[PDB]
Amino acid sequence: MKIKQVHVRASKIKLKETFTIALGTIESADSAIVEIETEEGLVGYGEGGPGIFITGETLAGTLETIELFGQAIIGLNPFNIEKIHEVMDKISAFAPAAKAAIDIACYDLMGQKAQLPLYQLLGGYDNQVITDITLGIDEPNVMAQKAVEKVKLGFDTLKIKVGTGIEADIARVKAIREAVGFDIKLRLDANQAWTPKDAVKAIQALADYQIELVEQPVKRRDLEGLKYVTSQVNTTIMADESCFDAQDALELVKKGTVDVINIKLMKCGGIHEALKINQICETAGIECMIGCMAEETTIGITAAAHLAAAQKNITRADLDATFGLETAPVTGGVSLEAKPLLELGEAAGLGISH
Amino acid sequence: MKIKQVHVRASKIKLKETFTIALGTIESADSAIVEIETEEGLVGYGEGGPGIFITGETLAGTLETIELFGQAIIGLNPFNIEKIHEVMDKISAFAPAAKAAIDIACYDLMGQKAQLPLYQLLGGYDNQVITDITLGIDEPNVMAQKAVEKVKLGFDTLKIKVGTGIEADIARVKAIREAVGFDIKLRLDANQAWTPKDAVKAIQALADYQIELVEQPVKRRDLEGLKYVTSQVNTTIMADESCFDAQDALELVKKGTVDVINIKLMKCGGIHEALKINQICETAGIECMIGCMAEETTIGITAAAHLAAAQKNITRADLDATFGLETAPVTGGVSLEAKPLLELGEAAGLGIS
Numbered sequence: 001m002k003i004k005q006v007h008v009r010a011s012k013i014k015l016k017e018t019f020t021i022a023l024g025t026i027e028s029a030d031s032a033i034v035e036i037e038t039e040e041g042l043v044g045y046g047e048g049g050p051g052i053f054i055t056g057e058t059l060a061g062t063l064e065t066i067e068l069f070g071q072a073i074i075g076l077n078p079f080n081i082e083k084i085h086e087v088m089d090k091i092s093a094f095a096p097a098a099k100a101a102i103d104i105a106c107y108d109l110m111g112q113k114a115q116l117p118l119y120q121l122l123g124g125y126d127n128q129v130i131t132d133i134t135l136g137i138d139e140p141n142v143m144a145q146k147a148v149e150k151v152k153l154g155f156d157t158l159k160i161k162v163g164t165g166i167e168a169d170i171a172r173v174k175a176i177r178e179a180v181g182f183d184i185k186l187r188l189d190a191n192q193a194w195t196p197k198d199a200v201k202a203i204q205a206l207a208d209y210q211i212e213l214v215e216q217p218v219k220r221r222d223l224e225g226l227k228y229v230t231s232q233v234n235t236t237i238m239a240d241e242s243c244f245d246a247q248d249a250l251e252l253v254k255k256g257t258v259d260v261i262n263i264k265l266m267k268c269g270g271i272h273e274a275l276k277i278n279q280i281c282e283t284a285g286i287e288c289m290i291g292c293m294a295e296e297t298t299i300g301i302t303a304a305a306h307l308a309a310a311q312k313n314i315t316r317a318d319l320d321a322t323f324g325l326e327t328a329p330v331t332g333g334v335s336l337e338a339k340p341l342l343e344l345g346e347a348a349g350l351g352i353s354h
Numbered sequence: 355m356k357i358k359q360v361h362v363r364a365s366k367i368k369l370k371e372t373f374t375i376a377l378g379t380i381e382s383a384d385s386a387i388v389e390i391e392t393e394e395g396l397v398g399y400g401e402g403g404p405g406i407f408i409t410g411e412t413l414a415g416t417l418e419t420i421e422l423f424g425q426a427i428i429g430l431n432p433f434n435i436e437k438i439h440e441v442m443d444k445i446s447a448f449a450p451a452a453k454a455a456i457d458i459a460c461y462d463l464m465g466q467k468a469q470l471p472l473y474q475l476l477g478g479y480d481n482q483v484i485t486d487i488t489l490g491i492d493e494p495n496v497m498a499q500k501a502v503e504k505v506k507l508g509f510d511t512l513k514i515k516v517g518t519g520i521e522a523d524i525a526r527v528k529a530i531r532e533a534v535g536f537d538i539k540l541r542l543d544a545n546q547a548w549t550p551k552d553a554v555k556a557i558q559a560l561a562d563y564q565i566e567l568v569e570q571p572v573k574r575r576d577l578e579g580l581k582y583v584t585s586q587v588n589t590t591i592m593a594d595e596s597c598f599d600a601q602d603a604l605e606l607v608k609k610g611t612v613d614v615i616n617i618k619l620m621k622c623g624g625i626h627e628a629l630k631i632n633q634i635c636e637t638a639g640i641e642c643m644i645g646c647m648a649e650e651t652t653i654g655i656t657a658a659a660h661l662a663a664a665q666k667n668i669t670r671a672d673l674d675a676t677f678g679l680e681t682a683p684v685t686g687g688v689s690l691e692a693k694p695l696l697e698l699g700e701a702a703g704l705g706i707s
């Protein structure tokens with residue numbers, strides 16, 4: 001198998017609602033979609049979802065970088081994922097969105113060539129995954145109200161954003177908890193909004209509210225502070241923005257900074273790197289959750305789902321990007337229907353087309 | 355795809371010459387060969403080559419463990435390597451040769467089902483690997499003579515076994531270098547024979563002999579002593595017995611114990627675990643060398659070679675076990691011919707039988 005050409009396009013999908021977190025707001029899912037054509041005719045799909053306030057990556061920069069990658073890998077075999085990453089890494093010192101777009105299309109091609117759904121090439125642990133659904137920052141009563149709706153859809157786990165103030169945030173969670181029950185799992189995400197000591201105070205305050213875990217409570221670069229929190233509360237602390245790639249993961253398990261690590265293909269540059277992170281974490285006894293950017297769609301979510309279902313240590317999933325899309329940019333893959341169960345079929349690769 | 359049956363049998367193959375290392379001698383390559391058959395008819399080949407003075411595993415124990423593993427994975431998909439290792443790990447707390455045997459057969463099946471050479475499923479970086487050849491412990495003049503012989507076979511890298519005493523060990527290396535010149539790369543392996551200070555002393559004494567690297571100079575459990583050697587000499591230090599699995603590797607990287615790590619499928623329980631070790635090392639800027647047990651045959655060596663060719667970070671290889679074998683247990687795969695280049699064909703999976 002040999003890459004004949006790489007085509008990249010912009011993709012802009014209107015979001016059903018404006019999503020808000022501690023870092024900013026978004027109202028449209030704008031990403032870069034890649035199609036890698038082989039000499040034999042097979043075409044793999046990939047996506048790069050840039051999050052300016054998460055990674056600093058932009059759609060313009062991502063499109064440019066992908067174009068450089070595409071010309072550099074013509075003639076290579078999609079199965080030589082080792083060299084493909086070598087090539088991209090030599091070209092750019094940092095561009096996980098661009099690299100993920102190329103990486104994902106390559107794994108899609110691998111599945112299609114082997115004639116196997118992707119999850120079978122990535123571990124084969126399972127052929128489906130259960131995802132939570134996130135609730136963007138809003139008024140305590142507003143969020144609590146939306147919870148009942150999602151639960152009604154079948155969701156047993158809700159991801160709750162907070163970060164305006166320990167005061168209002170605590171009010172947020174409480175409102176939601178005593179609103180949907182106690183059989184519903186509740187994970188919180190403060191997107192670096194709290195200081196070390198305020199984080200501890202805020203977390204402990206929800207002791208009787210039964211919180212599954214708290215995601216990135218402090219600034220991504222404040223590793224001593226993040227470890228402070230983790231070591232001050234019994235509640236499970238998860239690192240997100242503090243962990244982009246495998247080298248970050250190694251540093252975290254090294255220092256014993258957190259309990260769980262959130263993996264995003266758009267932060268690490270694709271499945272090849274995500275596998276490394278998960279392997280490092282599993283070896284250290286740290287479970288992983290697979291997440292997503294608000295700007296990615298069907299292709300990125302589908303890729304992440306195959307990986308999550310395939311790897312045992314990826315024990316949690318936050319793949320709800322497609323639930324907010326007004327329309328699907330492609331055919332097949334994870335549907336836009338807001339449901340917790342993402343079942344991967346037997347279609348080869350990502351099972352995506354059109 | 356589903357596993358229908360698991361067959362396992364004993365293979366006892368004489369070595370053409372007794373192989374001596376610091377830990378003892380080996381006279382026969384006795385391994386367990388497994389054949390995993392799927393309901394559709396595809397059959398995967400695997401092997402468990404236990405090295406008693408390395409892991410403590412025996413052929414009898416490896417056979418009993420494989421049998422336990424075999425009857426527990428009936429009906430599972432070979433592609434579900436994640437669950438297959440979970441099942442084996444729950445059954446046994448320690449049996450890397452047995453686990454490798456099942457693991458390798460599964461990857462062979464994956465390759466066959468996908469209709470792809472195994473190296474394509476494991477990274478696809480290359481389709482061949484260049485191996486060194488090891489010289490067993492002997493008198494300086496003899497080892498030197500044997501060195502010239504191997505170089506004549508085209509080998510550009512020789513792995514020198516040492517460990518009977520810094521006095522002799524230093525004499526062995528000096529003699530070898532004098533015989534083959536500085537064009538040949540020489541890596542040493544002490545198999546835990548030296549104290550940390552004798553190690554530094556021996557290494558410093560060979561500074562002018564252009565030593566590529568020194569493998570496991572001190573006892574396996576003496577990590578502080580191993581790091582001591584590593585931080586006392588400019589020569590590259592490699593861990594072998596100090597690193598069995600991914601957890602060991604993570605510990606070595608955390609402590610900055612060594613510069614390179616030796617991966618053996620028979621130490622870590624198969625390709626699945628070997629990949630973890632290499633990824634951990636790569637992430638930490640530690641290169642890896644793929645090695646082998648004397649007891650392995652074409653099956654084990656072929657699997658190791660596919661993995662080494664596939665992964666960029668596995669930059670060195672010591673896959674010379676088939677060179678000492680009187681016979682080959684299966685057709686295909688790496689041949690018995692003593693040659694540095696191991697070219698993997700385009701046959702699906704291992705390309706065996």
Ligand SMILES: NC(=[NH2+])NCCC[C@H](N)C(=O)N[C@@H](Cc1ccc(O)cc1)C(=O)O
Binds near residue numbers: 021
């Ligand atoms: N329906 C809906 N609004 N889904 C958004 C999914 C976002 C995802 N669960 C998430 O929280 N991702 C990041 C935060 C984030 C927000 C916005 C953008 O553009 C990028 C990332 C996280 O987990 O922190």
Ligand SMILES: NC(=[NH2+])NCCC[C@H](N)C(=O)N[C@@H](Cc1ccc(O)cc1)C(=O)O
Binds near residue numbers: 369380405488490672
């Ligand atoms: N002549 C011969 N049969 N050589 C086999 C060399 C195997 C390999 N290169 C090696 O050295 N492996 C171990 C040492 C070892 C010796 C004997 C047994 O049974 C198992 C392992 C090492 O690298 O230390």
Ligand SMILES: [Mg+2]
Binds near residue numbers: 189191215216262
């Ligand atoms: Mg987060």
Ligand SMILES: [Mg+2]
Binds near residue numbers: 543545594595
């Ligand atoms: Mg060794």
